[PDB]
Each structure stands twice: as structure tokens, then as C-alpha cells.
Amino acid sequence: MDIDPYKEFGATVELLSFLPSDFFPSVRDLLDTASALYREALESPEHCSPHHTALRQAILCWGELMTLATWVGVNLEDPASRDLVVSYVNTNMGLKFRQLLWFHISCLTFGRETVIEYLVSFGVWIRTPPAYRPPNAPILSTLPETTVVRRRG
Amino acid sequence: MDIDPYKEFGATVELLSFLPSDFFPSVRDLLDTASALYREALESPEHCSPHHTALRQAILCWGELMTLATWVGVNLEDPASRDLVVSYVNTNMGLKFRQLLWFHISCLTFGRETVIEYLVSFGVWIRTPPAYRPPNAPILSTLPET
């Protein structure tokens, strides 16, 4: 069974592979962002969108994993094995979770098509050799770098 | 965050717990059923249903867990711990997976409302003493009654 988590969203694992593995934020930062913005929609009984469904299942899965980590911590007869297992989950499996969280959380705030155009643009930027690479890398945002606001009444 | 996977589908973890743990098929039987019925849909480029989205994520997750199991098998020199961890994955997480696979696969085969009614009515049938219930265990079926 060759499922790609992104195929139904029109992305691919190769397109996100355009991003380097150290690009993605920490798990803590992504979970904090998700809790702050979409905790009330994610916990709702509505099929708000496929992004919410995916994000929900993934959070439950990461939870079952952290539970496994705590279980290994309390029920093992070896510190080395205990460390080896905890590291694999918080490192190898973590990178995968960080990538999915970023895509969905970014597709829900910025919008899917914005994320695909971002991925293409960043791919072009990072492929460029550093000698000719401009300093300002592409970034997802709504507002201009410097915002002009004045209020009157 | 506090989430039930079933809340968007109108079910609850309590309702799935209502049926006994022995009821749900093996992971092998559920994965073979899901592949045979729905492989082409799950691999499709489109959100055929939220049931498909959930199933996709879950299958990817079980794949990752089995990869972890193989990794422990090959890297963990300690066999006592090796067995302990491999067993936890295929017992606890195995039963969490079996329940979800059964629900989604069954909701696609027989329809969600049918599965919810089946969960309620089978749970009450198991609770009922055998002298005062219909003699056969309730089963989902797709054949016409004639």
C-alpha cells in the first residue's frame, strides 16, 4: 500500500523534499501554533476540512507515540535500549511529524496554493548557488515587511 | 489537546469500547480487506471521503510503527527489551489500530449510520443474557434479504 500523505492535497514528498530537513520548526513550536490557532476547530465535531481530519489523526498518533516513550521509560531493564528507542521516536519519527504539521498548519493559515507556490519558489532559491543567492529567502506571510497603519476618527 | 478520532464521524471512543476487544479482526485481515476494496481509492489523487483521509493517515502511521519494530529487531542487542517493545506495539497500538480500521472500512462498506446502529445493537445483544435474546450474534451483511 503506497500511500503518499500529500497526494490528495496536490503536493508530493519530492516537492516537500525541496525543503531541507533542518528547515522545519521544533515539534513544540508547531504544536503550540496549532493549539493557539486551531484548537477549537480541531476539537469540534465538524469535518471542517481534510486538513483538520489529517491534523487530528496525526496528533492522536504522536500522542500514542509519546505514551509509548513514557512506557519504555517506566518498563525496561536497560538504560541503553531505553535511550536508543526514545531517540529514534523523538528524532527519526519526529522529523516526519514536523514536516506534516508544517504543511497542514501552513495550508490552513496561508492556503494550499500559497504553500505550493512557496515550495516552488524556495526550491528555486535554495537550488541557487550561495554566491548568486539573494539574502532575502522566500517566507510565508500576509503583511508587508514594514506595515503602514494610521487611525482617525 | 483532547481529540477523539470518532467525534467528527458522530461516534465516540466509549461507543467503540462498548464492543469487546476480542470482536475486532486482526490487523492482517483488516489491511487485506482495505487493500482489496479500496486500494485504488486510497491511492487516488483526491479527497474521496474523510473516511479515506483518516484511513490513509492511519495506514501510513502503522507502516511507520512496523518500520520502528524492524529497526528495534535489527539494532536492539537486548532481546528481553526487544521482545517487550515489539509486543507493546502489536498488542496496545495494534488494538487501537484494529478498532479504527474496522470502523472506517465498515463505514465505507455498510454506511456510517448502519455501523453506529450495529455498535449499539450488538453491544446490547452481548449485554443481554442468552435465554432472553435472539440466538445468533448480530452481523453486518451486504447481501439482499431475498
Place this chain on the structure above:
Amino acid sequence: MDIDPYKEFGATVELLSFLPSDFFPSVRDLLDTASALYREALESPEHCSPHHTALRQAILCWGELMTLATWVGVNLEDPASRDLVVSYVNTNMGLKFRQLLWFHISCLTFGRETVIEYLVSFGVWIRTPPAYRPPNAPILSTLPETTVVRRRG
């Protein structure tokens, strides 16, 4: 009870927690700004806005804190203890005060939705690792080019 100061205003502690401690002005600077812009409204008997009320509350709380600080400085007869307490109040409770003063003062000047959007984008920026982060942070300012010309008709 569990109360979030910004929940009523459409923001969360998580959303504001991304701002670094270097970002907020000093207590003096914020109290000067609040008094200069909004003193006559804050002293007013009408409730101009909930933010105005929140600012009054925070100001009174900081005043009571500085009062207890002077008390210890004149009451506590230990030079070591005197310092520990005075420092905790100007540093820990000081940074908490600076964060709230900035939010309300800025929500009064720019507008609440503007401030929340700024927070979201600045968060996206501070979460980007420095190797990929654009070198200048997003800015919320009332000046487009720090040059004031006579207004058009």
C-alpha cells in the same frame, strides 16, 4: 481560576509568547507613552474601551508592585535579601507588565486586528531559523519613511 489576559481581546498567551524579551520597550518608556497618548482618556470617568480599562488595571497593579518594592527596600534590613526581592519585581513581574502594556497601547494605536496579524506574521518570522530568516524583522510603525510632510487636502 484560569484566566488568560489576552483571550478576551482575541489573542492568546501562546501567540504573544513568540515576541522576544528584547522586543518590548522599558517600563519607563511604556508608561511615558501611555501617559502622553492616553492619560486624559484613562483618567476620564467614562469607560472609553475595554483596553483603556485593562491599561488602568495594569498601571495600578505595577504601582502596587513598586510600592511593595519601596517597602522591602526600606523595611527588609538585609542587603542580600533586599536586592533579591527588588530584582525579581523589576525583572520577572516587569517583563510581564511590559508585554501587556505593549499589547493594549498598540491595540489602541494601530487597531486590534492589525496587532493580531502583526503577531501572526512576526511569529512566522521568529520561527524561521536565522540561516533562512530575512535579516530584518516585521515592523509595526506609523511612519512610511520617517519623514513628516504637510498633509494633502
Place this chain on the structure above:
Amino acid sequence: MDIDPYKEFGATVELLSFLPSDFFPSVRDLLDTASALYREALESPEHCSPHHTALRQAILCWGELMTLATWVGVNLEDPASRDLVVSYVNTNMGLKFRQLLWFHISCLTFGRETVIEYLVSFGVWIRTPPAYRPPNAPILSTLP
């Protein structure tokens, strides 16, 4: 900045001065009453009223005060100072908290007009010389 806590709500510090300091209920009791009647409203994202906002502000700051008190209780190596500081926060910063908690919690239950009317009458009563002061001090109630 000459901010008055009650000026926006139509009262003054002088008017509250009419009540004696001892009259105000203990912090624990006031907090329990607030939790019992308004916990859901206080934690809600809507601005129910200005008084609700003021009560939240008072709560979160008293919380910060108890946090600093806990900080001196775990860090200060002097039992003399440790005691002095904690005593100024539970007695001196607590009598101000008690006053504000009473005004807002009472304006939410009875109504602010009623609360301010009760401040004038209690004043008249405490001013009455004991030979003529009636044994029943004024009390707030919602009885029909």
C-alpha cells in the same frame, strides 16, 4: 497618573473609605464566591461587562502577587525577611484586593447602582453614634 480604580464605575476611593477596613470579607471567601458564580463568564472570550474585565485583571495580578510570595518562600535564605515580605503581601496588598473584589463581585450580583447606594447608607449607619446606631448594619440582598 492619578488613576482612580472606581472612578469609571461611578464611585470614588473616598466613598469606599466609608466602609471600615475590617468589613471587607477575607480573600479566600471572595475568590470562592467569584469562582462559584462567575467562573464560566470570567474565562469566556467575550467581554461580558467592564466589571468582569476589572475582576479578571484583579485576579491575575493577585495571582502574580502570590507567585512572588511563593518566590520569596523558596529563595530567601532569611526566615526574618521571608516572613516580613510575605506578611506585607497577604495583609497590606490583600486589603486592597479585598476591597476591589468586593466592589466588582457585588456590582455583578446586586447591580452597581445598588452597590453605590449601599455605600452611602452604611456610611450613614457607621456615622450614627452607638447609643442610637441600630444593631442591624445594612446588608446587601437579592430577596424579592
Place this chain on the structure above:
Amino acid sequence: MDIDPYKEFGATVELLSFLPSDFFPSVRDLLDTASALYREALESPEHCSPHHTALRQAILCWGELMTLATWVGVNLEDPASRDLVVSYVNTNMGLKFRQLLWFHISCLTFGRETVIEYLVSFGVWIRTPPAYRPPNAPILSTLP
């Protein structure tokens, strides 16, 4: 199952906590009042009100409790245990029964809105420090 006895009737266990345990009247007196005023309604086949149903449930269960107490009084061959068990049922299961009997019997006589309004006011009174607490505690009455 986190069932709250008074939640359906618009009250909470926290709100009833405001009254002291000693305040509630004795079981015998409450049962006599219920019999005197509502015996016919309670025994009727119609559902007069939800409160009437709750009162019937409370009565029939207290009856079962006294039945089990009678059972330990006639079967247990130990006077030590016989006493202990019976004492937990008349004191510990009796204070809960007294609370429910009071709420429902009082909601039937006064009205539930009135009963809940009396719970807030008694709270205000018991919170008042004794130096200012008036000698007349709040009381329910039907006087016009």
C-alpha cells in the same frame, strides 16, 4: 458518570456548599413536612413535576438504606461493627439525604427560583464577618 443531582434544576453542588452542613434540618422533620404537605401528590400516578419524582426517588432509596440498617441490626453478631455501619448510614448517608430533601421540598413550597436566590443570599450572609453579620440569618417564607 459525573452526574450532578441539582444540575437539571439549575443549581450546582458548589452552590449548595455555601450552606453549612449543620443548617440542614433533621431527617425526621423533613420527612414529616413532606408527608404533611405532599403525601397525596407523591403517591399519585401522575408526574406532578420533576422535583416530585426526585423527592420520591430520594424517599424510596433512604427507605432501602434504613432497610439495610435494620438488616445489620438483626444479622450482624458484632455490636462493635453493628454500631459502626448503622452510624455511617444515619450520619454520613443522612447528611446527603437531608440536603436533597431540603432542596426539593423547598423548591416545591417556595419555588426553585426562590430556593436558588436564597442560596446566594445565605452565602453572602455566612461570608460576612461576625462583627458585621446581622443576627437574623436569611429565612424562606411565603408571607405575602
Place this chain on the structure above:
Amino acid sequence: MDIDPYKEFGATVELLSFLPSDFFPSVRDLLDTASALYREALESPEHCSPHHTALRQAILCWGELMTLATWVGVNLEDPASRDLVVSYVNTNMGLKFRQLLWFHISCLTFGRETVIEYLVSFGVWIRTPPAYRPPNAPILSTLPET
């Protein structure tokens, strides 16, 4: 009586204090600017503006203070006191004069509302940490943007 010179002009002593004392130009620069731009108007027979009236009174007052300074210089035999008094006039009263001259001269050059907005926005810019503000100090200007 309690008067702010700025109250009739919609400003306050607090708002002028908001800008740092170092900001305002010297008395020489302000008097030269006022003479060059507005001498003919200030000397005119008419109330061109309340800004002109205020400026007129203030200039006459500074003239009187400078006369007092010269008088002390020539009559006061004591040099310690002579220096002490001359310094007080050109430091304290000097900064009170510099602030008022800047406000009125600037209100005539750029318009009152522009000057009030500049006072607010420059004060907030000085308060803002340098990493999170526009890099240049706000300046009043009369040139078109093109």
C-alpha cells in the same frame, strides 16, 4: 493661575516634554530661522496669527532676559554669582524658550496638526528599540515627495 502655553494650541507641556531635551535646536538657530522666515510678519501691524502673537511676546521676553544678563555682567562685581545667574538664564529659561520657539516656528512652517503628529510619532520612535523601528529618525520636511 495655572496655564500651559500650549493649551490654546491643542498641545501640552507633557507632549513637548515627551521629546528629549537634546532634540530642540539652539536659541541662535531658532531666532535666525524665525527672523528669516517671519520677521516681516512679526513686525507687521496685525494679528496675522495667534502663533505670531505668542512668538512676538516670547521674543520680547528673551530680549529682556538677555538685557538682564548684560546688566549682571556689568554691575555684579562678584564673578561666581555672576556666572551662576548667567548660566541659569541660558540653561533653564533657554530650554523653556527653545521648546516654545520650535513649536510655534514649526507650526507656522509645517502646520499645527503636522507638528502634533510629529511630536507623537517621533516620541514613540525614540521609545522603540532600534531593531524593531524604521532606521532613520523622523524629520519634518517641506519638499514634495517626488
